[PDB]
Design a binder for this molecule. Structure first.
Ligand SMILES: *C(=O)CCCCCCCCCCCCC
Ligand SMILES: *C(=O)CCCCCCCCCCCCC
Lengths: 86, 41, 604, 604, 604, 41
């Protein structure tokens, strides 16, 4: 089973105060969501394409994954971060 | 305990039966039969 | 002979390659050697026993004779043409494949049938302990029956067939002796089908129980040869595999473990604070390395494991220094340029990676438990890997805090969350760790009396110490179990050691006035507590400063003694304290006789 | 044949009814099948051995021939008239009941006799490790003897009969080779009565030890079939019984466990405080539910156990808020109207029962340990029962404080004594618990990679998770033990997994450019650490987010591999690292030879 | 017969002296009884199997016939002239010593040879789970092969000899059925050399698995007789040895344990402080015995152990009372004149010995972990010895602080470092401890329902309680394991208890209106949870106030039931829930068939 | 899988072979051979 809603409760609390960030496929952080795949808190990591939990540790530099897809609303948590980043 | 008669050589309510454990004969059937690969062949 | 039976192909004489298994449509006849008939007979014998219940309930189909599944073929019987040629058997008894199928599914089908009834017979039989182990004790049958007529719940099967179960029973419980028909009296002797087996299980008063004492020995012998207790203090490289390390994930409490008490954990002992920064998820946080030394898990000397630092119930003083609150606690690696324990200030710390942060600041992870807000049990957790740290001379795992804004309040705090119960789990058994290095083989004897009091309890899950402890622990249960290292019987174990102490104390006396002739009554007793202290706490034999136990001789000595000791126990090893043991069994039968006496009155 | 012998009571014609157990004045003759003579001979053989000590000490009574307890009757021998009819045995060898009694009490009486001497022979034999396991090593006999002439304590029996024990000994230790009388020299070969057995136990340098490697396998095979490791990740309802959960009482630390991390524990997350009242033993106390969320044990989803909340060593700040002192700490149930996590104020809490208070206020239970007064170790404790909470939708167990008078001081305290180490012990195994519900069957595969890091460590004593952990743990010791999952030997275990990764990664490549031909050197190595990470920490396979291990294939796969893997080990499985293992044994014999060299000098 | 063969040295007339072990140039011929040929044949049989791989690789040397190591001598064969006289064997089959050497080193040399190949065959065989346990399931051979042609790493041996390993394989995996040459189709039946063994291991759907259920029983039977579970609640002195206490070093947290909850720990409950002095290493320090009661380990009632008080992670408030810093923490004995708990002031304390101080004051042992400086994990540690305290009526071990200068600041501190995790390890098993006294024998029944909730958890490592807990724990795993005390099957265990409750509740009803006829449906169910609560938490049966379990009958009752219960399980005990167990196995084979289906497509 | 021919009675790539497990015959050889002192003699 995907996520385990204890994970999603850590998504919103990391997005209420925006900490998250968006990592791309080349393991670099961006803030645009278009090139980004990995989503952190930094407790849990989720690739935005397949939308499954990957590693409870962050530093997505040490994560192995094989997925490839496009279009992923919710952008709403991504939108809630930049409002709460102020 | 109703009388039977021949089905089996002993009646349960039969005459002069006797429950009486003896430290000497510890009641036991056959549980530990060996069947493991090497030991059964 | 053994194996399938073979007759040659072309015909005439059978020359290898002229012999093929005599496959038949039913299947290949495999020989039924003498002993293998003992099993299938012993299995069928236990089923025939239930004959009276098979007829009663119209199931079954008559008694199962093993002579219905076999045959009387003859030929050469081996495992291969070559070797089958040396086993000419005439009119041997073979069972064809298709038969080896029925004798199987029959014993299986019937086995279910009986397994069920046999369960009802029991809830009723054991429901009045028909087994004592000292002297006798009766219980007038009328009462007994009229009693179980009650207790037994309405869905047994001993109420629907009393003397259809009774006849099965009489053959399993030499307690129930049926009254003979033509003298209407018992028999003294009880003749249950398990005549011999049941005779050889009785707790014989001379020596505990042959069936017990016999196994407790063969059992220990298994281990002794198995794990490899032998060679326990061998002085030479041994593959970790030789230690079958399994289910081995030990947990600690660092930020407490002194650096010298366990190589895998160095500390930043520096004068002032070392506030560094790092953009983690956009937001910029400051790792602290506060006032105290902040002991951090070193990365080298850290067998690619699964580090899972739990931070719960531990204090979280966001109440005082408000600086602490708002900071998401997180396990973070720290690569330093100059070696730690030489890393003075921020410019020294190469980089800092948040290998696993905790979403939500330190004011949601809290929970007030009487003023002192604690940490809601949560597990941060990296997955360190030997090579992800290749080259990188200095790098340390640190479960710190990541403050979003360092202040004067957090000037004496030091946010190391290491006070939490960290649990490393070696995820790659082949590689062990010793004295700070990663290896593939241990040198047992080296790890003896080489750790300190706590250079043991501070060992790292699946490291030589923890391996040379898991090992002694087996050998410790073989002695504890089989050998009598817990009575004044100067056993084979405490005896192997005594001979070492003598040979040792004897040469230390050679050269010089030799004013002290060896003791012996004092040596026997000193080695008795030495072997005893070992069985007690196997570990000790690793700590520097333990009397006797830590001299190179012992252990290497002990085991090889305990070794031969098990390979001779006899059968009646149980003769040890078989007196009080006996007197205790009579004690029970006297109390159980007391029970039967009430069953005998209440239900007249 | 087997069982008691029968004979045609009706004479001549023996049908399935004209038979009858041939009983008589001696009891019933039970047949002594070939193998059952091996035992009684092997038992008597081990006694005859001690012949020289029986005469010396005038006990015994001559050598015990098994042919003195049997007879040569003939008839049909089975378990029941029906099946005994198919075993016509002529002049078979049967042992009558009254005889099966002596061969028993004789082997028992003699067994004591020898068990004693045999113990003295030993404290002297092993008292000079007569067993090495690589090459040889002597120790000039004179010295040896003149040495033990010392060590051996004055109450042995090897000093009263030297060459009366020696003759017994020579047959048990192929180390002591007696000097032949007519050439006055040893024999090279050593001929101890255990000729074969002792030959097949020597640590053969080709492969560790047949007796070892053989058992370590049959041992693992036992478990594999026994507990039911097979079917370990079966996807379908399984009675908890199928998991033989025993000796299973896990302890925690709630008031820390997050509610979502373990369904059996909800919290009162409400704005202000919820001071309620209750007349307990006359006196009126106020349960608090203070400032923080106060996590309480939920009652539903709580398998009628024995909750025993221990409150000791934990802080007790009666020093500051004087309000805390005077209040008797006590575990109390709390039935709320509206569901908790929706229960705002006092009027919401239906009632509150003090299921177990602690006599004497909080100022006698204290004990100063450096300012911070702790709690004198005491155990409050309910005995929750499934149905005592029937209907009652909301009810929670809370180990709070029961303040005799709430004040401003206790306005930020929150008296939950849950920070203490609570120990629930399921008192009714049949019923398990999963995800918050009580059930009678688990669905194994469901519990895999379905818990989180701590949705495992927070499991409730005897709940699916704790059961699907106790199970993997057995299977984890079968591999850890038998299979070599701890060396670069790409064993049967890590091999079963590799085949899954391939078949898996291979179809994920099907459809689309297939630009990546499967790896294999990388797959073998990835599955090696997967099988290895399992043996390591069996638990992990329950946590969501574990590489390989948590895909549905593996485990279901692994086990069934490890399964057949054990059923073929051969005997010489010990060939693994039987090189360094050998070289280590020679290492020991070289050091032990060094010992004999001193025994040889000191005592010339 | 058995043993070495003898022959009339005096010729013709063979008496009990005219015999002599027929030794010679080959060693001594030892007889090869029927069963002992089963082994050496079963061992050689497993080697011959690998015939096709021995020729392929030019090793080996032809098939090993056991008839090449034996002979056909004839004479009398026994263990000693006396008993060998009753075993005249003619043309028996004996194996000479020098032969018992080759059949040994051959089976050893060959065993290595095969052990290796046999390992390659496996990484390839199990590398596609050739074993299912419900119904069948194929996998088109072409694919299968063309698949392993991949996976198998370039250094196997199944790629260098495909159908040289295949021929060996066909005899071990009845999964691979070779296509018959003259009809070019399979065979339905599979004929692997292990024909029977492999038939009797299949998980027969009627009852789990005979090989499993059989062992899980014999296994339990071993324990039941072994440890001495029987006699578990015997009411009479029993040597501690009878409890085989091993690997037994329990750890605590005193300064919390109430004095009445565990006799081995008294406290200085006195009004004011008791500052004493003592010159330790020159410097004069002051032991405090501060404000609170300061619970100290009593020395009498303390089985000469290895007390190792660890003081780590525990608070160290040198921040406030500066008095605390500078004082080296140290475990110190304290001999008092008047008995403690009556020792008022300093003049009362005879002397104080620093049995083990910690070098370096309390300001180097610290380590800041968020304000509250903790204790760098360190282990102080005495080695108390029964007699070093001879005569001395009052003496106590106290892990205090040793302040170099008492002040007003430390007037409410109380420096007892006992809050630390102390770990006593009995170093001399023979002597146990009970209710505060040291003994050599326990009285089991006495320790039942005689401890309180925590008069158990506070037990002292290797004391009656801890022994009468280690014991129940074995018996708890025999029931948990073998018997089904975890399903509504009113098993033999919960049945033995029900009969006690009846006989008990029945006489309590005798005399007086007897208005309540015994229940039974309620009694069965009450005793079911009683037997169940036991298997669950074996310990409970020691605590005063546990329903049923703690009445003298039970246990003494239970065990003796469980006892006979194991000695009758049959073989098909696995019939329990063998329905869902079966349905779960079919569930797996359906999923595994799904796997073979992909192997079948991807690699066409 | 290259054709052999006589070394062993079966070719691996031979005509009509067939991998096909049957819950009935659990493959497996002989591992648990008993050799312990008392039991081997
Ligand atoms: C008639 O069936 C009255 C009940 C008497 C016996 C019923 C079963 C209880 C006694 C068992 C006898 C067989 C072995 C326990
Ligand atoms: C020729 O060797 C091509 C490869 C086909 C078989 C190689 C080994 C893999 C199959 C094993 C068959 C024997 C038992 C697994």
């Amino acid at each position: 089973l995907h996520m385990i809603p204890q994970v999603a409760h850590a998504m919103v609390r990391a997005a209420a105060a925006g900490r998250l960030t968006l990592y791309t496929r080349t393991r670099t952080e961006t803030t645009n969501f278009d090139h980004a795949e990995y989503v952190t808190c930094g407790r849990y990591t989720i690739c935005a394409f397949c939308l499954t939990t990957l590693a409870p540790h962050a530093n997505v530099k040490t994560i192995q994954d094989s997925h490839a897809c496009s279009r992923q609303p919710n952008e709403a948590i991504r939108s809630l971060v930049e409002v709460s980043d102020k | 305990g109703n009388v039977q008669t021949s089905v089996n050589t002993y009646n349960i309510t039969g005459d002069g039966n006797s429950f009486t454990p003896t430290s000497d004969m510890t009641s036991t059937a056959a549980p530990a039969i060996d069947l493991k690969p090497g030991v059964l062949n | 002979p053994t194996g399938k039976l073979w007759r040659p192909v072309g015909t005439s004489v059978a020359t290898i390659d002229s012999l093929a298994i005599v496959s038949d449509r039913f299947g290949q006849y495999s020989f039924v050697n003498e002993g293998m008939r003992e099993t299938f007979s012993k299995a069928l014998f236990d089923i025939n026993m239930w004959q009276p219940l098979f007829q009663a309930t119209k199931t079954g189909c008559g008694p199962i004779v093993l002579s219905s599944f076999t045959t009387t073929t003859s030929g050469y019987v081996g495992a291969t043409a070559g070797d089958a040629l040396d086993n000419p058997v005439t009119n041997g008894v073979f069972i064809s494949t298709v038969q080896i199928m029925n004798l199987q599914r029959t014993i299986a089908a019937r086995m279910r049938d009986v397994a069920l009834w046999q369960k009802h017979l029991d809830t009723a039989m054991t429901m009045l302990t028909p087994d004592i182990s000292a002297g006798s004790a009766s219980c007038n049958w009328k009462s007994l029956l009229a009693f179980a007529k009650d207790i037994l719940p309405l869905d047994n099967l001993c109420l629907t067939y009393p003397n259809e179960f009774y006849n099965v029973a009489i053959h399993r419980y030499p307690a129930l002796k049926p009254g003979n028909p033509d003298t209407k009296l018992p028999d003294a002797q009880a003749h249950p089908l398990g005549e011999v087996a049941g005779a050889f299980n009785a707790a014989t008063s001379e020596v505990g129980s042959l069936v017990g004492s016999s196994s407790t020995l063969s059992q220990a012998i298994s281990t002794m040869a198995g794990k490899d207790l032998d060679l326990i203090e061998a002085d030479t490289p041994l593959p970790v595999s030789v230690f079958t390390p399994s289910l081995a994930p030990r947990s600690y409490r660092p930020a407490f473990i002194k650096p010298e008490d366990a190589k895998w954990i160095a500390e930043f002992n520096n004068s002032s604070l070392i506030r560094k920064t790092l953009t983690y998820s956009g937001a910029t946080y400051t790792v602290q390395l506060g006032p105290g030394p902040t002991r951090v898990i070193d990365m080298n000397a850290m067998i690619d494991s699964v580090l899972t630092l739990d931070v719960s119930g531990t204090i979280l003083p966001y109440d005082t220094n408000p600086d602490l609150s708002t900071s998401v606690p997180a396990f973070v690696l720290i690569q330093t340029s100059v070696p730690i324990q030489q890393v003075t200030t921020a410019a020294n710390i190469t980089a800092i990676t948040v290998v696993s942060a905790a979403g939500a600041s330190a004011i949601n992870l809290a929970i007030n438990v009487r003023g002192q807000p604690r940490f809601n049990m949560l597990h941060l957790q990296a997955t360190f890997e030997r090579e992800t740290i290749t080259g990188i001379p200095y790098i340390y795992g640190l479960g710190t805090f990541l403050i979003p804004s360092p202040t004067s309040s957090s000037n004496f705090s030091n946010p190391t969350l290491m006070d939490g119960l960290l649990t490393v789990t070696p995820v790659l058994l082949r590689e062990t760790t010793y004295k700070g290095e990663v290896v593939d083989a241990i040198v047992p004897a080296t790890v003896m009396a080489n750790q300190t009091s706590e250079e043991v309890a501070s060992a790292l899950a699946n490291d030589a110490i923890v391996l040379v402890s898991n090992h002694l622990n087996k050998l410790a249960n073989v002695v504890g179990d089989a050998i009598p290292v817990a009575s004044r019987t100067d056993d084979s174990a405490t005896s192997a050691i005594v001979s070492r102490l003598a040979v040792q104390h004897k040469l230390s006396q050679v050269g010089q006035a030799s004013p002290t002739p060896p003791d012996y009554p004092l040596l026997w007793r000193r080695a008795k507590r030495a072997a005893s202290m070992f069985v007690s706490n196997p570990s000790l034999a690793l700590q520097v400063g333990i009397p006797v136990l830590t001299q190179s001789g012992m252990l290497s000595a002990l085991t090889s003694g305990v070794g031969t000791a098990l390979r001779t126990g006899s059968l009646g090893k149980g003769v040890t304290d078989a007196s009080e043991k006996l007197r205790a069994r009579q004690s029970l039968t006297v109390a159980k006789q007391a029970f039967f006496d009430q069953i005998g009155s209440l239900w007249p």
